[PDB]
Design a protein around this motif. Structure first.
Motif, PDB file in Angstrom:
ATOM      1  N   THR A 184       0.810  -1.202   0.000  1.00  0.00           N
ATOM      2  CA  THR A 184       0.000   0.000   0.000  1.00  0.00           C
ATOM      3  C   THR A 184       0.846   1.255   0.000  1.00  0.00           C
ATOM      4  O   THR A 184       0.350   2.311  -0.368  1.00  0.00           O
ATOM      5  CB  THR A 184      -0.854   0.099   1.271  1.00  0.00           C
ATOM      6  OG1 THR A 184      -1.534   1.366   1.302  1.00  0.00           O
ATOM      7  CG2 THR A 184       0.039  -0.031   2.494  1.00  0.00           C
ATOM      8  N   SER A 185       2.096   1.152   0.451  1.00  0.00           N
ATOM      9  CA  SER A 185       2.828   2.333   0.839  1.00  0.00           C
ATOM     10  C   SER A 185       4.323   2.156   0.853  1.00  0.00           C
ATOM     11  O   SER A 185       4.850   1.043   0.751  1.00  0.00           O
ATOM     12  CB  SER A 185       2.417   2.775   2.243  1.00  0.00           C
ATOM     13  OG  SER A 185       3.274   3.802   2.728  1.00  0.00           O
ATOM     14  N   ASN A 186       4.942   3.329   1.000  1.00  0.00           N
ATOM     15  CA  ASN A 186       6.368   3.634   1.196  1.00  0.00           C
ATOM     16  C   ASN A 186       7.239   3.823  -0.068  1.00  0.00           C
ATOM     17  O   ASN A 186       8.453   3.997   0.061  1.00  0.00           O
ATOM     18  CB  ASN A 186       7.022   2.724   2.272  1.00  0.00           C
ATOM     19  CG  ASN A 186       7.350   1.320   1.773  1.00  0.00           C
ATOM     20  OD1 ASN A 186       7.389   1.026   0.574  1.00  0.00           O
ATOM     21  ND2 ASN A 186       7.592   0.442   2.718  1.00  0.00           N
ATOM     22  N   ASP A 187       6.615   3.852  -1.263  1.00  0.00           N
ATOM     23  CA  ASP A 187       7.309   4.187  -2.520  1.00  0.00           C
ATOM     24  C   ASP A 187       7.587   5.696  -2.598  1.00  0.00           C
ATOM     25  O   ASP A 187       6.861   6.490  -2.005  1.00  0.00           O
ATOM     26  CB  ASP A 187       6.485   3.819  -3.748  1.00  0.00           C
ATOM     27  CG  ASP A 187       5.962   2.399  -3.724  1.00  0.00           C
ATOM     28  OD1 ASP A 187       6.683   1.453  -3.323  1.00  0.00           O
ATOM     29  OD2 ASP A 187       4.797   2.266  -4.151  1.00  0.00           O
ATOM     30  N   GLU A 188       8.653   6.077  -3.291  1.00  0.00           N
ATOM     31  CA  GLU A 188       9.095   7.454  -3.337  1.00  0.00           C
ATOM     32  C   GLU A 188       9.253   7.921  -4.737  1.00  0.00           C
ATOM     33  O   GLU A 188      10.081   7.360  -5.473  1.00  0.00           O
ATOM     34  CB  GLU A 188      10.462   7.657  -2.646  1.00  0.00           C
ATOM     35  CG  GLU A 188      10.402   7.383  -1.173  1.00  0.00           C
ATOM     36  CD  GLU A 188       9.692   8.470  -0.412  1.00  0.00           C
ATOM     37  OE1 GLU A 188       9.479   9.560  -0.996  1.00  0.00           O
ATOM     38  OE2 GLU A 188       9.364   8.199   0.753  1.00  0.00           O
ATOM     39  N   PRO A 189       8.515   8.995  -5.128  1.00  0.00           N
ATOM     40  CA  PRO A 189       8.723   9.529  -6.452  1.00  0.00           C
ATOM     41  C   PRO A 189       9.926  10.429  -6.524  1.00  0.00           C
ATOM     42  O   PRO A 189      10.133  11.216  -5.632  1.00  0.00           O
ATOM     43  CB  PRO A 189       7.454  10.320  -6.723  1.00  0.00           C
ATOM     44  CG  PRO A 189       6.889  10.636  -5.423  1.00  0.00           C
ATOM     45  CD  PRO A 189       7.353   9.626  -4.459  1.00  0.00           C
ATOM     46  N   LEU A 190      10.769  10.230  -7.533  1.00  0.00           N
ATOM     47  CA  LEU A 190      11.984  11.003  -7.682  1.00  0.00           C
ATOM     48  C   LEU A 190      11.993  11.532  -9.033  1.00  0.00           C
ATOM     49  O   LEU A 190      11.563  10.854  -9.987  1.00  0.00           O
ATOM     50  CB  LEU A 190      13.202  10.122  -7.476  1.00  0.00           C
ATOM     51  CG  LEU A 190      13.352   9.504  -6.075  1.00  0.00           C
ATOM     52  CD1 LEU A 190      14.621   8.628  -6.011  1.00  0.00           C
ATOM     53  CD2 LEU A 190      13.422  10.551  -5.009  1.00  0.00           C
ATOM     54  N   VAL A 191      12.481  12.748  -9.168  1.00  0.00           N
ATOM     55  CA  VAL A 191      12.653  13.379 -10.493  1.00  0.00           C
ATOM     56  C   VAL A 191      13.730  12.702 -11.329  1.00  0.00           C
ATOM     57  O   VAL A 191      14.813  12.504 -10.873  1.00  0.00           O
ATOM     58  CB  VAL A 191      12.985  14.867 -10.376  1.00  0.00           C
ATOM     59  CG1 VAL A 191      13.236  15.481 -11.739  1.00  0.00           C
ATOM     60  CG2 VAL A 191      11.854  15.600  -9.676  1.00  0.00           C
ATOM     61  N   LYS A 192      13.415  12.380 -12.569  1.00  0.00           N
ATOM     62  CA  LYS A 192      14.325  11.722 -13.438  1.00  0.00           C
ATOM     63  C   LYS A 192      14.705  12.570 -14.628  1.00  0.00           C
ATOM     64  O   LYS A 192      15.661  12.255 -15.321  1.00  0.00           O
ATOM     65  CB  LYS A 192      13.826  10.347 -13.720  1.00  0.00           C
ATOM     66  CG  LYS A 192      14.220   9.466 -12.536  1.00  0.00           C
ATOM     67  CD  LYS A 192      15.697   9.560 -12.151  1.00  0.00           C
ATOM     68  CE  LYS A 192      15.955   9.612 -10.650  1.00  0.00           C
ATOM     69  NZ  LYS A 192      17.310  10.179 -10.339  1.00  0.00           N
TER      70      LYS A 192
END
Ligand SMILES: Nc1nc2c(ncn2[C@@H]2O[C@H](COP(=O)(O)O)[C@@H](O)[C@H]2O)c(=O)[nH]1
Ligand SMILES: Nc1nc2c(ncn2[C@@H]2O[C@H](COP(=O)(O)O)[C@@H](O)[C@H]2O)c(=O)[nH]1
Ligand SMILES: Nc1nc2c(ncn2[C@@H]2O[C@H](COP(=O)(O)O)[C@@H](O)[C@H]2O)c(=O)[nH]1
Ligand SMILES: Nc1nc2c(ncn2[C@@H]2O[C@H](COP(=O)(O)O)[C@@H](O)[C@H]2O)c(=O)[nH]1
Ligand SMILES: Nc1nc2c(ncn2[C@@H]2O[C@H](COP(=O)(O)O)[C@@H](O)[C@H]2O)c(=O)[nH]1
Ligand SMILES: Nc1nc2c(ncn2[C@@H]2O[C@H](COP(=O)(O)O)[C@@H](O)[C@H]2O)c(=O)[nH]1
Lengths: 174, 175, 177, 174
Positions: free
Chosen positions: B74-82
């Motif tokens: 459900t959780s703990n993914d991190e979006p990062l700028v690529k």
């Protein structure tokens, strides 16, 4: 003295945006009538109707409601309907009331009560150029040009070109 | 399952948003749109064309790309700028970020940060087609096509013609 | 020359209401930490914690963030708040953190606080409570909990006095200068 | 069924929070009365009154308005007031109408009309446990337990312990 909040251009852009909101929320303006309150409301309603005609290509009917303040004085003033001129049947139609300024809400409630009593619109919405706060009834505008925070001792001046030879919204002392 | 916006409703929401942007920025002078990821970028281009039509001046569109990174456990993914491609200097300019769906707000927060490693804009605003609620950060959209509170066990499907060959927004059970 | 917007009683009522909003939205304040920003934010956070302990019977942890304004682009250009220190006495990972400040204006201070927390921990969420929202946001940031909206004109600001810091509780609007 | 939205605990927390909002915005609840609509609204008004008294030590009066749906055919139904029990003079007082669900707004408008006509309160506010959207009048709640937009083809079930022997709010396909 008075602080100018909207100039002619800012009024035009707010009304243009409002027209596109109306088209959006009513999914086209078919079966919708605009009804302006009092003098300035009617001129706003006409400006909106012209804009909507230009966007969608179909005319929008505009009606009028006249409302006047009655006093004790003997104090709660009461706005009462003095006349309505609506050139089509509103039953099972969407009606959008239009006014310049929303304050206590008592004028709109009188307008709303009049319409609901004399016709069975499928819904009644409200568009105002300015919401100045301080409602005394649970009434809100669906469309708002500008929210203008005020104190009770302040007043909002709305000038319109048709009525006042200037397009301007400003705040002033009593 | 409910359809929330069909093609026509999408078009009318985006037209309204364009007029809102002209209104609030007082003309779209010194204002740039930056789209997030594929669908945001296409929404930004749509808005830019509409604005050009209304005001007669082009509006610059930039892009930011953002990828989800994941950890194990459900959780703990991190979006990062690529990547970012912003073709003009944003310093002292108004930037409007554009995305399809606002949910947690984490993607926007990553984009907002990035912007600040490419110019000091005078302000950053956010336009989204759908706000689905459940923020996990104190982030809000300034322009919203449709406000659509959802459960964590639902998902919003956004389809756009440029990517999906259809325009639609619908809610379905995540389950 | 200032207009009093909130007196001591109205400040107490707003904060009490905010505490109940927090408990409601978090479905209890288990696994929630309050973190105050700068001096007045911290004292607000402490008040809110004491109220929540009273309502629910469990203590709420309070941390602190310190944030200072830096200038100058050297061309004048907009100032930047930067974090100077943080003291958070427990692990925030997978916890709900509620930032607390006295006044929300551009949002830049809270963005610095948020960026700090997200960097150094991985909270499950971050929320914001403020006593006053003055408007004029320059970033897409909003408070979750707001004591009073007090829109200000260009020349106005909001004076916040707290008993712990100012020897008086009051919120007023005033003309700067 | 289609979804639960509030369980018992959530209902208790929302009503506690509402009570504190009412104390705050009215600066204490002096000269303010609650009026519940129909059965469930009255039970909610009573829960709120009891909570309010506990917070600052001041009692709150509770009145009741009964409202029935009248139909012209066996979807334009009309809610009409069937009775009111307001035990104090409301002139120059604040009144808060309380209901379980706000939908079209027509029930509240009828209730409002009943008060505004027969006392001259200084203001009328509205508190509801659920706002389900689809308004047909420019009416909004000042206090809301949970804002829940819905399709016309679902219904909101509100269960209250006093009546239903359970506290719950849920959505149903109907
Ligand atoms: N121009 C202007 N009209 C006002 C103001 N306050 C109330 N009104 C007028 O009174 C009605 C709104 O007042 P309400 O009935 O909502 O208190 C509108 O028809 C509007 O024209 C104001 O501050 N400025
Ligand atoms: N299409 C779609 N995208 C979503 C949904 N939830 C999150 N997203 C995608 O993930 C990002 C927003 O998620 P957030 O970072 O705000 O949790 C957006 O770039 C959006 O495209 C959804 O429910 N439907
Ligand atoms: N209309 C409708 N709204 C829903 C449904 N399920 C969830 N929601 C919306 O999304 C919210 C769910 O939040 P939750 O408490 O499940 O995180 C509800 O308060 C409601 O506004 C549904 O079946 N129908
Ligand atoms: N007392 C007070 N502090 C302010 C005001 N405007 C901004 N602030 C302070 O500056 C920060 C918020 O400004 P922002 O970063 O949101 O522009 C807060 O930490 C707050 O202490 C105000 O009008 N009065
Ligand atoms: N329980 C429940 N009551 C409703 C619903 N829709 C309308 N009502 C009832 O009808 C009134 C609100 O309907 P309205 O007049 O706003 O359309 C309230 O008195 C409420 O009890 C619903 O979906 N569920
Ligand atoms: N979360 C959720 N919201 C719904 C659902 N069905 C309807 N709604 C809400 O009800 C609103 C209006 O529904 P409509 O009148 O357009 O069918 C939608 O825009 C949406 O916010 C559903 O299954 N889940």
């Amino acid at each position: 003295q008075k602080a100018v909040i909207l100039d002619e251009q800012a009024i035009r852009r707010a009304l243009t945006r409002i027209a596109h909101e109306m088209i959006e929320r009513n999914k086209g303006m078919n079966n919708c009538i605009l009804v302006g309150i009092k003098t300035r409301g009617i001129y706003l309603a006409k400006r909106l109707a012209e804009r909507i005609e230009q966007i969608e290509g179909n005319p929008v009917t505009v009606g009028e409601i006249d409302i006047t303040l009655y006093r004790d004085d003997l104090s709660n003033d009461e706005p009462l309907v003095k006349g309505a001129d609506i050139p089509v049947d509103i039953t099972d139609q969407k009606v959008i009331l239009v006014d310049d300024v929303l304050y206590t809400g008592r004028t709109v409630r009188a307008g709303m009560d009049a319409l609901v009593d004399v016709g069975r619109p499928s819904s009644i919405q409200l568009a105002v150029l300015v919401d100045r706060g301080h409602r005394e009834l649970p009434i809100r505008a669906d469309y708002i040009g500008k929210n203008i925070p005020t104190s009770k001792s302040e007043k909002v001046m709305v000038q319109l070109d048709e009525v006042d030879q200037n397009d301007l919204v400003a705040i002033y002392e009593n």
